[PDB]
Scaffold this motif. Structure first.
Motif, PDB file in Angstrom:
ATOM      1  N   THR A 126       0.835  -1.196   0.000  1.00 27.32           N
ATOM      2  CA  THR A 126       0.000   0.000   0.000  1.00 27.32           C
ATOM      3  C   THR A 126       0.876   1.254   0.000  1.00 27.32           C
ATOM      4  O   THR A 126       2.048   1.214   0.382  1.00 27.32           O
ATOM      5  CB  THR A 126      -0.934   0.043   1.228  1.00 27.32           C
ATOM      6  N   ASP A 129       2.600   1.517  -5.820  1.00 32.53           N
ATOM      7  CA  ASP A 129       1.775   0.906  -4.782  1.00 32.53           C
ATOM      8  C   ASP A 129       0.431   0.584  -5.422  1.00 32.53           C
ATOM      9  O   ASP A 129      -0.339   1.486  -5.761  1.00 32.53           O
ATOM     10  CB  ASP A 129       1.605   1.872  -3.611  1.00 32.53           C
ATOM     11  N   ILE A 175      -4.304  -1.804  -3.078  1.00 34.17           N
ATOM     12  CA  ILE A 175      -5.719  -1.452  -3.002  1.00 34.17           C
ATOM     13  C   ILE A 175      -6.439  -1.631  -4.338  1.00 34.17           C
ATOM     14  O   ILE A 175      -7.503  -2.240  -4.385  1.00 34.17           O
ATOM     15  CB  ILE A 175      -5.920  -0.001  -2.475  1.00 34.17           C
ATOM     16  N   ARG A 227      -3.676   3.537   3.436  1.00 35.23           N
ATOM     17  CA  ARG A 227      -4.604   2.860   2.543  1.00 35.23           C
ATOM     18  C   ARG A 227      -4.872   1.438   3.028  1.00 35.23           C
ATOM     19  O   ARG A 227      -3.959   0.706   3.423  1.00 35.23           O
ATOM     20  CB  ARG A 227      -4.043   2.846   1.114  1.00 35.23           C
TER      21      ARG A 227
END
Lengths: 160, 157, 161
Positions: free
Chosen positions: A74, A80, A83, A118
């Protein structure tokens, strides 16, 4: 009649962690064990969308896995993708997870830094997935404050 | 400022005699100086929910539509998705604050699973909350009631 | 090392404000300066989607701009388009900004009114954008509680990325 034993798969998303250095994955196992749950699958997967999705689906297809817990990958940078990768697989997003995770982190732990945090959780069929940041502190907070208290309730609702 | 509201109870099992939440919504509004101009218990499916919300929208004496029930994390809980599809603009703060307040002052971690949504449709507003009277009470006292006048005012400007 | 000086563009979304009456734009400048940052660009833009997006992208393309901060044009009516306008340009939305902004506003400033507040933050390339309500109270809270504490870290994370 007794504390339900939930079976979970632990997924550590990292291009650098190894079994000897996976502090967060180890913590997940200890927290679950102490809570009366069981780990039936564990793997450290490379940090890329396809590897992450494959690991989540692998857990979903495992007969003795009720929940998939992932940590790492995350962040706010382009590299990243945890998510987004997980979000694409969810049937229904349990938005309260990411929201409360940030709210509790802000008020009780890292403060304003939580703005950049996140996390996401949701269902896939009659199973559930929770994806948290990679730090052990993020893992500990998410598990103790939100996931552990609700695991039994969620699996029950999904299986009924 | 007497806001006129339609109350929708989403349920396959409730009846007028057992609809606690719908009755509570009536009482809360009345005590706050508002009025209920429409009320109905509709079956729990996406199409019945959407039709009930739009029926309220098209009623000249309805300023706000309030629904309770049908929410959840399972496949057969479709209230949030059904209502979300009709909104022009989602008032994201409603679902968010509803869960935050529920967590801090009421059900704790259970709030992580709570579902609620609010938003506009033309010059009107819709608020959908969980079916328990406790969820209805918290949503109304902490967020909706104090803002009904402000919202309707802003939307009719 | 030393407190890094972040370069920001200030965008005030309004069809009436002028440099002399822009109370919120002035506040943003003050807060940034006292925090050790610098304003390298500033403009009051008309309140419409296209003008807002253009002002944000102009900031992104400006070599000496690291962050773009906008205030104004938010609301729950159809004529309030800041959030949607900015959202369409973001690569990744920093959801925690809008969420915590509302939560803190609820607990410390305006209570239930925070439910209607709109704000959004996100990245465009290696740069970041934060859009907040136009009131001085909104700006003060967003800046002191969330943005100022994290500006250095964010730009650092994006510069290395």
């Amino acid at each position: 009649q007794a504390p339900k034993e939930v079976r979970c798969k632990i997924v550590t998303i990292s291009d650098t962690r190894t079994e000897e250095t996976d502090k967060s994955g180890q913590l997940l196992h200890e927290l679950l064990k102490e809570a009366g749950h069981k780990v039936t699958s564990y793997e450290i997967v490379k940090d890329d969308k396809e590897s992450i999705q494959q690991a989540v689906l692998a857990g979903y297809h495992k007969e003795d896995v009720d929940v998939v817990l992932t940590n790492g990958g995350t962040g706010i940078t382009k590299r990243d993708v945890t998510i987004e990768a997980v979000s694409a697989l969810l049937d229904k997003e349990i938005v309260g997870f990411g929201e409360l995770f940030r709210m509790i982190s802000y008020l009780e732990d890292i403060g304003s830094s939580a703005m950049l945090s996140r996390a996401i959780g949701g269902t896939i069929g009659r199973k559930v997935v929770f994806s948290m940041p990679g730090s052990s502190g993020a893992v500990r907070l998410a598990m103790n404050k939100l996931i552990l208290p609700e695991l039994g309730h969620i699996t029950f609702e999904l299986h009924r």
